[PDB]
Assembly symmetry: D5
Homo-oligomer: 170 residues x 10
Amino acid sequence: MSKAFIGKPAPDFATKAVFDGDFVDVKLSDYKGKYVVLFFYPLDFTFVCPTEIIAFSDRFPEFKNLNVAVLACSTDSVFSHLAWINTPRKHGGLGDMKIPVLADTNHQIAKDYGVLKDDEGIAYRGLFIIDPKGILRQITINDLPVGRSVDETLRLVQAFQYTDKHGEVC
Amino acid sequence: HMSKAFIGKPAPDFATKAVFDGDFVDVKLSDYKGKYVVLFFYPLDFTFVCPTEIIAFSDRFPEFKNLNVAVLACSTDSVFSHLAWINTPRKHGGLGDMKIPVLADTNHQIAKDYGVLKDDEGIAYRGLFIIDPKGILRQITINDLPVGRSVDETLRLVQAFQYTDKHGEVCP
Amino acid sequence: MSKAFIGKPAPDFATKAVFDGDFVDVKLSDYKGKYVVLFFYPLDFTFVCPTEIIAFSDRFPEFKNLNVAVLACSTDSVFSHLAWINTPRKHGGLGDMKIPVLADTNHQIAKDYGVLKDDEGIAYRGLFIIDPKGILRQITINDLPVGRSVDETLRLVQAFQYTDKHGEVCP
Amino acid sequence: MSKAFIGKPAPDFATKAVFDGDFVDVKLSDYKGKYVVLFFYPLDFTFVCPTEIIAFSDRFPEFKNLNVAVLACSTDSVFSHLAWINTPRKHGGLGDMKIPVLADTNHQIAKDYGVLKDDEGIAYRGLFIIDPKGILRQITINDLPVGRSVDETLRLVQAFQYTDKHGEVCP
Amino acid sequence: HMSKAFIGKPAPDFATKAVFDGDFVDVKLSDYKGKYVVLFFYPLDFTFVCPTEIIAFSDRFPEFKNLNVAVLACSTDSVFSHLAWINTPRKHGGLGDMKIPVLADTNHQIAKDYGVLKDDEGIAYRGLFIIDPKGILRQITINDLPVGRSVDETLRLVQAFQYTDKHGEVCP
Amino acid sequence: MSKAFIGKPAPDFATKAVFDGDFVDVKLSDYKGKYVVLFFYPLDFTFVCPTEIIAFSDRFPEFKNLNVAVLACSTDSVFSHLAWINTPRKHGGLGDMKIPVLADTNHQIAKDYGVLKDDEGIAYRGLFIIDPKGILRQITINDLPVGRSVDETLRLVQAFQYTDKHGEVC
Amino acid sequence: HMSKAFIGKPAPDFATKAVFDGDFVDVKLSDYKGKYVVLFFYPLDFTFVCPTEIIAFSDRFPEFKNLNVAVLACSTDSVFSHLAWINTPRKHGGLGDMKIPVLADTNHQIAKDYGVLKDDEGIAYRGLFIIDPKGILRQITINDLPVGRSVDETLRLVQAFQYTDKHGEVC
Amino acid sequence: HMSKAFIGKPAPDFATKAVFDGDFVDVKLSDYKGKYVVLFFYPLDFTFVCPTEIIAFSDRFPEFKNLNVAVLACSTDSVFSHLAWINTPRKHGGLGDMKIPVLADTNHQIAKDYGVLKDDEGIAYRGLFIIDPKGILRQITINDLPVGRSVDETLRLVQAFQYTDKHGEVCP
Amino acid sequence: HMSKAFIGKPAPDFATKAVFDGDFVDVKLSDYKGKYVVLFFYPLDFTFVCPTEIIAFSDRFPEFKNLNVAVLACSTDSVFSHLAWINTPRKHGGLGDMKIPVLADTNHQIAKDYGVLKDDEGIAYRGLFIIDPKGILRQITINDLPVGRSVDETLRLVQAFQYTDKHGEVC
Amino acid sequence: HMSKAFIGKPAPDFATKAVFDGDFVDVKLSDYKGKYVVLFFYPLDFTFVCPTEIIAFSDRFPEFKNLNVAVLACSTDSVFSHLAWINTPRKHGGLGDMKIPVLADTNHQIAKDYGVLKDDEGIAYRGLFIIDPKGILRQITINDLPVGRSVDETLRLVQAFQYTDKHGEVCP
Ligand SMILES: *Cc1c(C*)[n+]([O-])c2ccccc2[n+]1[O-]
Ligand SMILES: *Cc1c(C*)[n+]([O-])c2ccccc2[n+]1[O-]
């Protein structure tokens, strides 16, 4: 069962990830005081390109500018992640990744966020926005064929940051 | 109790009264087979907060109709409450003319089924769902109360789903 | 499901309401030592003019004269109430309301008093009388098409007030 | 425990009663096509004179005029009723009763309508209105010290009778 | 639901209102410790059937008092109903003066506890119980409605119990 | 649990008994159309005499005159019964018995009539009156030290027989 | 309902009245600590069939006493029934003088605990049990109704148990 | 798991491999319908204690055969263990030649059914059971491990049952 | 949650996608009736540790084919991950050409059914199973993560099973 | 009853009688704390099949001792059966002298715990288990009855674990 609810504390997670070509540990508490964008993707080494996943890495300086962490996640391993990172974008790989890419091989994080496709053991294209106090603020879940807009995600986070300080105004 | 909304599975069935074209009409999910459906929730009628978010879907509905997509607005307010707010001009902070149906979920049933109900208040969160011609739920968007939704993004999603329905996904 | 019983403590409630044009908090404990009359109505902005609801507001000086609080309630929002209050009575609105109008978007108060029409999420035309000690004394529930009488409500409260002090009757 | 709900079929009952000085059987189905007013009272032979019960008997021609049946009921025996009927009104009795007085020694009818004071085995001062189609339309329950008004009962039935044929109101 | 009356065990405890000497009094089983108690039930007040059975226990109560035995009458009629029937003279088919308390079990609780309740009518069967000084139930007699009970037999039993309490049983 | 209730069909029983010095089978259905008086007693060969039990045997011609069967019962065996019958009344025995004496060694009949003293496995001094249609009409249960009156039993049966034909009259 | 007798386990505890030397006495299992006990059941008192097999245990009790062994007879007959059968001469099919205590189990409790109760008749099967000084069940013997038990065998068993208590296995 | 062995009830059914006349054979209780059957249990093969108790039943089998009685021995050892012990001469603490079948209960099933299984060791107590022609259990004998059984006693019992089958109604 | 693999029982049935000869193919257990199957699990794709032990089964598959035996490799990695690692040269720590099918169990289903799933990591232990032609599980081998399996041993086992299928026991 | 044997978890605890150096001894798993332990199961004593598979582990025990490894054999036969088979010369299909302990599991407890018990026969499958110094299970091998185990394989596995304990982080 899903543990993700709007207004309630975001489901806690701890796993290995790949960041700057190295294995590192990533917890939700590590990003206390910051806004967090956690987004899921189905599979490593898919024939259709990860242009959407790349787009979040390329435009990370914009997220860093707003003091916002971006975390990528799938049910593939950290070893699978690093390999796809080591694959050039010319050969349908990820190339250099400026965001951490999380491994959810135990399916725990997908399950907790309720984005697991049970009959396949892979994650739907979900995207979650978590505030500085660790409260879940936004849920977005897409069916497999359709990716997510970076512009929209930026619009949402800035809207949330603005409404945090200002409440409801123009 | 439990949300019935799942990606890949049939979208939760709903049947309620609504306001369309200044009349009370019956609205069922079956009424929209062979068509894409965008169902979106809002919290309250007669809010001091700008309804420009809800109005935007009505104003830009010709864009949705052009793509053969039905748009449905919904809240836990009454069908009478809907009509009164529609009858209020936009100058006084009303909805004015609505080109889309506004569903009444005083039942709380649809909000519950789509899992968008704020239990302690009996109002719906700013959720928006995309349902395909086959009655299969394709997209879930739930926002916390202060942040509204973008029409452009909703259009970007629905067009992407329609394209991927006939074609396969393609990289270059 | 219902928590309302005669001779037992009346179901506790706390919600937002509209009184004198402002949003205020209403708790049951706020009316300790007074008799309370809590009455429900189905919907805001009905085509049927709300003459029964208006009558309890207009004749409230009589209730105040007896040190009796009168509270109106429905499953509509506080925003919905205020809009209907701001609507003139000639245009089928409530007009000036001299009693507080409670918002039960929770369904909690209706459920607790057992006046909720489940299939519609609206309250039946119920009326309840609660004594100074917070004990429920009277239960009245009407089907939707029929409203309530202020004269009866006053007769009931005055009968309860008299029997609290005296108890028994010559006729 | 209770079976009584607004808009649902009224709880079915069949018991012995006293009408016109004889023991007769009373079933709910016997009053199909008529509006029924069923009201409960606590006890036979109270020191309090039964003026409220007597008033419904005396003013019954008005109820008959509207094709409306009126039934009184308590948890006392049919023998107890008849004795109280045979007691003159000047000696704190019922006198001539022009309506049937039902014996609920079963507690069954009281339980079904949810007016039973469990700890005492007596019924609260409840009144119920049932339509020609056997659907419950109105619920009224009073704490013991306070009786009911015939004028209100007539106002209610006439309001229900009018709205059955017409439905909506100008005022 | 269940009868609580058992031979050798403590008799079911009861506490109710009653009519004694033209007044409403409170009656408890504890009020009779160190004394033998005869508790008997009857069906209805104001019966067309001769109450001579109930009256007989009142009339011959001096015989019971002489043996230091308390007699209690009971039915599921009200304490007000009891008084009205007591106030009715024996010439009109009343009880007249009652030298014993008449308990009101409108509660149905005592009838239930002694298992004498005719469920479908909410009346008590013609049951009669004998309880010793220690609050131990000693004798159960339950009769079907048409047949009354004998005072002489009740006296024969209570005297036998008192004799066997101090002495042992003896043959010759 | 007890199965005996006033107005309801009397608990059915079938067991061996001793009648005229022989073992015979006795059923409740055998006495259909007749009134039946079933009475229990605790024990065979008690030092206190069975004068009460004897009294029902001696005065049986009175019961036979009213077409009424009298049945005695205890949790002793048929062999124990016959032996006590074979013991002369001079030596605290039963002597000749004109009523059948039932054996309830399985405790089934006592249990069904709810007269069993569990901690001892013996029956209390119970007496039950059953009508021609097999309906239980009267319950009498005495504590061990106190016996039962034949006069009272006769009064009851005749009252029941009268009220059967007449209803309620003088 | 459930048997408690298990080999190698503490023998089911019992306490009841019995007849010994023509007197009512209380018998407990704890009374026989530091000693071997032979408890044997029989069906009925005043059985037409020869009780000689039961009698044989009483007559040859000097042999059991010589080995420091207690013998106990038991049935679901009363303690009064036992004494009466004891007072009946052996010539007239009685027990006569009994050197061993005869236990009354009108309770059905001891039979149940040893699992020798014939439910449909409320009588005990011809069971025989051997309990050691520490109170541990060592031997179970249960015969169907028509067949009795051998005193020689009982003796053979008990002294074999006594021998193996101190020696073990002489091969 | 609890015992299935009751007197007067059909004896627990069994089917296992056994060693008869130096060969492996299949043994069923149904095989002895119409005959009296004596089934006895023993703890272990290759014990330092003389199997003289077991031997005695084998040697004196012509007495049982004369009375049309089958005799079955059993333990929780294998058939391979049985044959090994049978092939061991009696001079070297073996069984020697066996006139009776020796049943193997390696799965502990038959011991469990007859309630002779010592759980903590997985071995059978020295039990002996007598079953009639109709397959009804007639006699239960369970001994603790250190004490053996008497053939004369077994024979006395068997004949007593055969006599009472023919007549009953005994006066010994 | 529960393992289904039992010796002497029908081997747990499986159906999944796999990589064979550089193509995505469907693999079922029913596909291998009338033949011996060796199913073996491995933890992870693109592991830094030498996959040579896994590779050895592919290289020496001619020996397995010679005995009419099917070899199946499996892990909780995707079918896309398998192919990518296959396309990675053995010089760069890849699989290279694989003569045997490599099954994808992102389901976790097959690992669970064979009871080789390491729950906390969602990866399979180094398990190896031998299934006969009738589809009955004959051998279970499970190794902890750091230790691999011997092809010689797998061969020794399978041909021993094939020999005993037709001969029994040559003593 | 189900299996308690899991990889990475503490190995199931056992305590039974065994035959070592021609004597009965008590064996516990706790006795080998700080050592690697190989526990293997076999079906039956006195089988017509050569116990050469069992013999091979006994003969080559000095290789296991060199690697500080204990080797334990087990079956559901008795210690009396074990000693009998050990005392049987290898020329006559016996075990002969045994350098390893042979555990008796007559109560079926250890087989059950390791999930190697064939229920319908009450015998153990040819299982082999490797336990580390901390008492953690490291390797499971279960064979069907007709197929034996390799000493070389057992030795290969043991050393691989000892090496990876010291270093880990392998690149074979
Ligand atoms: C997006 C994409 C992908 C996935 N792949 O594989 C290729 C390959 C070769 C050229 C272009 C290209 N694009 O663009
Ligand atoms: C009543 C009775 C009893 C029981 N017993 O035993 C005897 C014995 C001897 C003389 C008289 C007598 N009575 O009367």
